[PDB]
Amino acid sequence: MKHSLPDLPYDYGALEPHINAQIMQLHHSKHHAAYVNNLNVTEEKYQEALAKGDVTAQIALQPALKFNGGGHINHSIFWTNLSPNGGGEPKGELLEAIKRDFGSFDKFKEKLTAASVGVQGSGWGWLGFNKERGHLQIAACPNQDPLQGTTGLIPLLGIDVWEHAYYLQYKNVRPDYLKAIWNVINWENVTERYMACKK
Amino acid sequence: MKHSLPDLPYDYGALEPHINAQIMQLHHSKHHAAYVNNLNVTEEKYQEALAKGDVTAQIALQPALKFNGGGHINHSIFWTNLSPNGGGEPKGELLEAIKRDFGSFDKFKEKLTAASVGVQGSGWGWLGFNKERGHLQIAACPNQDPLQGTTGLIPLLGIDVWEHAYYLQYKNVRPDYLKAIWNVINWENVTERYMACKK
Amino acid sequence: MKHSLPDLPYDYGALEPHINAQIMQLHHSKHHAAYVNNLNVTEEKYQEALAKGDVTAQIALQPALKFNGGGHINHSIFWTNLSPNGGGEPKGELLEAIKRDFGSFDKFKEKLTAASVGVQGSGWGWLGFNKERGHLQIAACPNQDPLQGTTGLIPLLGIDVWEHAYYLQYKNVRPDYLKAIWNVINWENVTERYMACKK
Amino acid sequence: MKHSLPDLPYDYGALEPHINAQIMQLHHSKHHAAYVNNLNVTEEKYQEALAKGDVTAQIALQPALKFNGGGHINHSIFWTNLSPNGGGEPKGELLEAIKRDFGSFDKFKEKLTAASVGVQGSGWGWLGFNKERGHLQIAACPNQDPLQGTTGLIPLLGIDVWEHAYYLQYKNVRPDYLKAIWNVINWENVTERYMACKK
Ligand SMILES: [K+]
Ligand SMILES: [K+]
Ligand SMILES: [K+]
Ligand SMILES: [K+]
Ligand SMILES: [Mn+2]
Ligand SMILES: [Mn+2]
Ligand SMILES: [Mn+2]
Ligand SMILES: [Mn+2]
Structure with a gap:
């Protein structure tokens, strides 16, 4: 399975005037999108490293996994926390x-x-x-x-x-x-x- | 002595089109200004804590000192690194x-x-x-x-x-x-x- | 002020058989003593750095201050927590x-x-x-x-x-x-x- | 794969008087052994988490993976660095x-x-x-x-x-x-x- 970018549950301008449309569009479609894609890349590299017992490679991948994985986790929650x-x-x-x-x-x-x-x-x-x-x-x-x-x-x-x-x-x-x-x-x-x- | 915000060595729009005027003005006059002021506040708190042997207080002040102090150090160098x-x-x-x-x-x-x-x-x-x-x-x-x-x-x-x-x-x-x-x-x-x- | 190594509230063998006398003697008279001595050295260096506005020097001293200062704080509490x-x-x-x-x-x-x-x-x-x-x-x-x-x-x-x-x-x-x-x-x-x- | 504890390239007392036999025996047979065992446990948990797309679980496993994995990597090198x-x-x-x-x-x-x-x-x-x-x-x-x-x-x-x-x-x-x-x-x-x- 692959992680995917969840759709935003409202339109990009739905939270104006509190958070503007340009921010919502960039934040969801550029920032979160990047985290999702780089997470999937990182997970595949990790699966190869695990299968080979390459512990050095697993450890080198931790920052990318926490960063992109965490990015995906956090923003998936964040969009639903707003309305x-x-x-x-x-x-x-x-x-x-x-x-x-x-x-x-x-x-x-x-x-x-x-x-x-x-x-x-x-x-x-x-x-x-x-x-x-x-x-x-x-x-x-x-x-x-x-x-x-x-x-x-x-x-x-x-x-x-x-x-x-x-x-x-x-x-x-x-x-x-x-x-x-x-x-x-x-x-x-x-x-x-x-x-x-x-x- | 007190730390002070160094003047920018060029006008806020001098680096356009590479870095725009709005950024330079915010970055220098808001961001660096804040670091300088919060550094001076932190240093005074540290001097009191040192004089009292309050080690807990010294340690609680470390994040603010590194953050604001580092902010002052880094941006003072950065402005001179550009022209x-x-x-x-x-x-x-x-x-x-x-x-x-x-x-x-x-x-x-x-x-x-x-x-x-x-x-x-x-x-x-x-x-x-x-x-x-x-x-x-x-x-x-x-x-x-x-x-x-x-x-x-x-x-x-x-x-x-x-x-x-x-x-x-x-x-x-x-x-x-x-x-x-x-x-x-x-x-x-x-x-x-x-x-x-x-x- | 000059920090000092607090006297232990009991003799080194008072916590036997649970923590042996050799450990208590080393832990108090060598480990904690070193934290106290290195804390005093670090605090004096920090006073010089503060007087000069040397923020780089203050930040370079943080690991020694947290380590030795924290060591002093923690062990001073620890000895009193046991009897x-x-x-x-x-x-x-x-x-x-x-x-x-x-x-x-x-x-x-x-x-x-x-x-x-x-x-x-x-x-x-x-x-x-x-x-x-x-x-x-x-x-x-x-x-x-x-x-x-x-x-x-x-x-x-x-x-x-x-x-x-x-x-x-x-x-x-x-x-x-x-x-x-x-x-x-x-x-x-x-x-x-x-x-x-x-x- | 299952990681294993490498044999020491010399006997436990071979580095005396510089590092004593009790240390070498504990260090290899208890400390490194624990890193190997806990690494294998952690890798299996990670394989389950990966198969499920459980990113939270992957991230929760990072400290154990770095600690035990790093322990295995480092000590495997260390033993060969001495003679x-x-x-x-x-x-x-x-x-x-x-x-x-x-x-x-x-x-x-x-x-x-x-x-x-x-x-x-x-x-x-x-x-x-x-x-x-x-x-x-x-x-x-x-x-x-x-x-x-x-x-x-x-x-x-x-x-x-x-x-x-x-x-x-x-x-x-x-x-x-x-x-x-x-x-x-x-x-x-x-x-x-x-x-x-x-x-
Ligand atoms: K709207
Ligand atoms: K507003
Ligand atoms: K211009
Ligand atoms: K440009
Ligand atoms: Mn974000
Ligand atoms: Mn900046
Ligand atoms: Mn201790
Ligand atoms: Mn070791």
Whole structure:
């Protein structure tokens, strides 16, 4: 089997004025596309190296596998985490978990914003679920290091803070992007991911 | 003493069409400015922590010091490494060193381009001088990790491959930026840095 | 200030048979002593670099500062975390927190053992307190990276899993060391550290 | 394929008094054996993950693959780099390369000793061959990160500076171990590895 670029679940201009059409089109059709293709190339090289017992070759392929693999994992989640129907607050058990674990929805937003603003260089802020503790948890990841593969936490909501995710529109002012993105968070999707972790 | 933002040695539009005016203005007046200011803040916090023997506080400040400090170091070099009078090939002893160490000027360009294109996420490609071996050396650095502070190599020529260095103009196509930047390399400056390493 | 090697709170053979006297003597009088001495040297170099605005020099000193500084921080806590009168289970609010956060004392032991066994290369397992969440948390740290300086978690109980902490007695069998050390945990000290986090 | 633990090319006590028999026996029959066994387990898990397109699982397996795989790579080279008939200086083209690249054999020894002493935590010092530059190069690697897999340099001579490589005999005094090991370097093997890089 081969990994493929998932279609975007909405039109490229559906998240304006929060994230512009040019960004969405580049981000999906150029950036994610590249990760998917380079992941498939890397996986094939890895299969050859594994079959030959070439451990040196396997290890040389790790950065490309984590980078492109992580890129595919993260952006596949990210597109579903956004929606033109998004924004506002979550409801039901996710909201209850947020209040219990972070005090309030606004305190939660502050913590995820702070983690996302705090990434030095390229990376991601995440709300995840800690299976072992049975509660929510915030973490930041560098580059395309994916949340579950590197920490064990199950991803619920990711915020891409690579410059490509915002620069054309917001330039250097990452906090303006982080303010805007709250308006398009697909809480339906984040709730679905959360409910799949429980039971 | 306090670190300060060096003036750009040319006008913001001096490197068009290779690097556009909007990029130069943002990169110098917003990005580098931020690094300089946050470096001075970090250094003052470090001086307090040192005076108190607060080792925990010193260690907590390391990421900000490397990031903002490195940002200041790297961009201060980068502005002088470019010029509207740049491009072409170097001459004299630098050219002789390039031919001796890399075979030819074009082979050297291939290696520095490859290191620069190869940065996954944010970072820099460098031509440096290895004092101990007495020859040239190429290295890549992540984020704002500066060359001399992290490797001991003396920086001669740096290529910023953070998305902010090219994205407004070249979008995702980093190789187009790397082709363009060869036209504005200030070989006079790179030669001056090289000659200061010898003797 | 000049950092100093804290006196051990018991004699070198007080933790026998669980950690032998030769290990305790080497670990305190050679390993920790070296961290203290090299920390003082590094801090003086940093003071000179700061006074000169030498950011390159500050950054070059970071590995020595984190390693020796972290070494001092970690081992100063570690000695107080152990006692000849230790072992068994904690009581009062710490025990209540352990049961609440990890299910039971035995489940907690399993998780901290697993984190400590899981360190590949040199490092530490920690029980810490997350100030922001107001609960207990287990984390692992590489090398001498200290818990609070690198994660913000307040250290309560640390387990050194550098080979020097066990190798003379247990050789490669780190799990035997981790089983043994439970017999000398100073729960009085861990409780004091925990109570200082609350209120 | 199933990786296997290579036989040692001499008996466990053949490198006495420089590295004692207990160390060699533990290092080969326990440490390297564990890397081989855990590598085979990890490779099988990776084959399942690859067949399923489970990229998360592939990425979660990277630390075990690099650690155990790197451990296998590094120690397989290390055993052949030592010999009871070793020590003294190399001859022929390797000696000429050492003199050309480092000034002299004694200056080379100083640099490889310094790189090996300089490892903070667990790792290796290496003399390698840079294929691209066509000359010798010294590098250090953390943990079990292997030289060729992580840097592209071809390994010629490795020095293990994990505490398990010396602690039973030399305790904390790593420099005494590094002085001793020069007496058992198998220059015949290092020459064979060097000659395979050329032509
Ligand atoms: K629209
Ligand atoms: K907007
Ligand atoms: K112009
Ligand atoms: K152009
Ligand atoms: Mn992205
Ligand atoms: Mn920049
Ligand atoms: Mn220790
Ligand atoms: Mn070893």
